[PDB]
């Protein structure tokens, strides 16, 4: 009696598909043929942040757009002052296999995680003068891929046990768990209104979740391989997904399908990091081909290449005022661009 | 956190006396610690400084040569060795910690003080030396400087303080606008490039003391005479 | 006034020394280009390899080219100011190219014998690149101070290198043959033979090929440099050997062998490594 | 019976996805390009600022 | 020759 | 808060960062891989929901980090990129269990032909040799059923430096090594080389074999960076 629920599952899977082809009335490449292009965005390396030992796997900007934390697999975080190339803090970790990093939007806390399967929150505003571990959030089976703060007492952790989880830093336990994926959930981006978040996994599927309810509102099934990087549009109604089939893909929530395909025939390497600008016009994507590219999000034309790194770009982040782009890679150096 | 000092007593004017402050409760080796003294029935006056790691060591010109500051990061102590003790060095010697990074709050914790009785610079002038207050009003303590404290990086470097009667000074506002941690939201300090203010919006009985000021642009850290409130 | 060589030996020395420089300055400064202008082969280990290949190119452009014209029918045709320079930088390029090979020999010793120990840092390699030159500028300096061009009516025997006395001239070329020949050969004979023992006993064929180089580098150093120093020793104390009139031939054969050591490192790095073979095809 | 409760979880999530409001693509693509034209002049990477208010130079 | 050769 | 004292804190951090670079460069990192049947959980005992296990040991004043990755999911295509630029991969294979030896050859094929483990050399510890000696001296389980080409394999001449045994266990154990070097020699370049060893339950020389092989791994990392290849 499994096929009675398997043939009804394929019937709703095509009823989803004919409900999307009815809405696919005009390509975004048709509405954006008469819109002017961007031009050759030629950025320059303004700062270079030296001091990490091993490869950098994650960075995150702060909301002041001046401080940033960077995670390296020598086993420590460094909070940088971007205008000075100073080191505000250097926090040694318990594990040496950190894969995610998150600066809290208040500025008081910072998070990391990795193959230890723990999200470790760090208090930076202690009266003792040193950075101490505030909470050590255990409960995931697989490795931690992405953590993102919502406020000072809640965090959303993506892991490779096919689950995402919303935590509580004071209590230390899971508020709700998100259990829809069938693969290692690799990336995670919150909405600007912090009410929804998307999560891209290794089943070539992005899923839009609700934080309060704990459901999966929409699923997005366009990619051909493992989605490594996800990023919300600044208005909260679209998102871009980077995957290992050398394709970025902009989706949308109100239409529930794919919009554009930022692919190129020369590019075979996969995408490790993806990010939008402040206006949502540029889609900066980091590649395994040692260099980041600046796609234009409405025309899908490569309008710039950032080519300063001598290894795999694994981190990318645009500030909250859109001033700079920081780009961390496996050559132990970050680079801040304008 | 705690900073307790030891030393003092009656010293002959040609004699010597070594002070010592024992830090216990914080990461002492990451804090640049100062020495600030207070003559009897007078204001505050800066004496010495030693950085985090015994690097930049700065003295005041009135104690230069005679006074040598030192540091012992394992045993968590801070010393002040005086060689020839002139009679104007009669004071109560405070020991202040100060950490320096982006967004830090220096001069945030002060020691209790030891009484050592012996028997160019940016002048800061606080005009009013006594303000009569009642609990409930909204007072404003003014402050003026010689040079403008607005540096080119973007933030002015004025530091407000409060010394309650009997106690040690505590930091209220750092960098002229930022409320310190532990201070209530009544203290809304603001100001301009060379004229400053500290508005206490609703006064309580714990707000009675001598409100000092400080600059941190040039390294002789000159204080004010102190606006004293009384109820 | 003589030493005027006929046209048939000025051709047979020149096709031998032009082909020294045409392998040197067309093989050495393509190796600095491989290391500088790239990013993969631009690490801290290769900084000695550009200290050597630049000092070899100075040893092949400033030393064996100007002293070849002054060796043929002597005729110092370069004035009386370049002679003070000829005894300073072309001579310090000899001692910087030799003390570089001693530095690469002890660097390769610690890369093989104790390979797990970390190698010299990027600041520690530059404090020993420069300390080679300071020890080499100090030793070429007593020939810059005494370069007294006392030319005759005729430019035969102009660039005199030592006009004080022969008993002090013998002592300088003994404290050069100890510091520049005998001491680098014992270091390269202790380092490269303990290394040659270790590598000797598919990829072991590439480990037994580097010991064919270290037999060549030591024994095309003791053979290529020995008639060079013996010439300046046997002329310093025996000043009557200068007027022998066949001293022009035995100088040029002694000087060719010492400057034949210039072209060896581009040949060695390409016969061994595949990243340098592709750098010469490009 | 163990995987019948797991196959029913997939057909209940797909029923909550097949019954949602989907606007047209031309309405969602026009509302994306209307956001980029509204915030274009406050984008310091697409429209670069001078060397005075650039804090990294 | 004389003939003074250089190093 | 002077900026001169902020850059003094930054140059007190870089002094601490330089003295943890020297510990880091002098420390060799390893990666244990192997199934649950292998004795990977026992070599860590013979040496001196948490998802990673570090095991530090020193032999001849040289520090070694092992990383026995556990508490993970089944698929490893994503976190195996983290262990790129590691010194070696200790791969432990149970040479006694005949039926599950082909999947030990399949996941060794995944390690050796991975795009990120291209430069990394594998130290095979063909474990449980005493359990292999008692299996062909009993003669019950046969290798010819699980592998059809054991009937046409003979022992090579320059081999078997064992004290005492019959060549049934030698033709067995040198064929298991031969199947694991059919993968390392065919589908691999000259950037990384396998190192087969035969290890037992209580064998105290397993930390010496790692030290001798890692000394050879760094030697070819040094022979290539000094351009002497």
Residue numbers in the entry:
A (entry chain D): 3 to 340
B (entry chain E): 2 to 120, 136 to 247
C (entry chain B): 76 to 276, 289 to 369
D (entry chain G): 6 to 62
E (entry chain A): 8 to 14
F (entry chain C): 7 to 54, 181 to 361
Reported in the publication:
The SP analogue peptide agonist senktide showed high activation potency and selectivity for NK3R. Senktide was observed to sit in an orthosteric binding pocket that is almost identical to those of NKB and SP. The N-terminus of senktide is modified by the addition of a succinyl group on D1. The first residue (D1) of senktide was observed to form a stable salt bridge with R330 on ECL3 of NK3R. The potency of senktide was significantly attenuated with NK3R mutant R330E, but the activation potency of SP was little changed. Third, senktide-Phe3 was observed to engage in hydrophobic interactions with V235 on ECL2 in the senktide-bound NK3R structure. Mutating NK3R-V235ECL2 to alanine caused a 64-fold decrease in receptor activation upon senktide binding, a 5.2-fold decrease upon NKB binding and a 30-fold decrease upon SP binding, suggesting that there was a greater interaction between senktide-Phe3 and NK3R-ECL2. In addition, F2 of senktide can form a hydrophobic interaction with F78 of NK3R. Thus, the specific interactions between the N-terminus of senktide and the N-terminal segment, ECL2 and ECL3 of NK3R result in the improved activation potency of senktide over SP or NKB. Senktide activates NK3R with a selectivity of > 60,000-fold over NK1R and NK2R14.
Neurokinin 3 receptor (NK3R) is a tachykinin receptor essential for the hypothalamic-pituitary-gonadal axis. The endogenous peptide agonist neurokinin B (NKB) preferentially activates NK3R, while substance P (SP) binds preferentially to NK1R. Herein, we determined the cryogenic electron microscopy (cryo-EM) structures of the NK3R–Gq complex bound to NKB, SP and senktide. Combining the structural analysis and functional assay illustrated that the consensus C-termini of the three peptide agonists share a conserved binding mode to NK3R, while the divergent N-termini of the peptides confer the preferential binding of the agonist to NK3R.
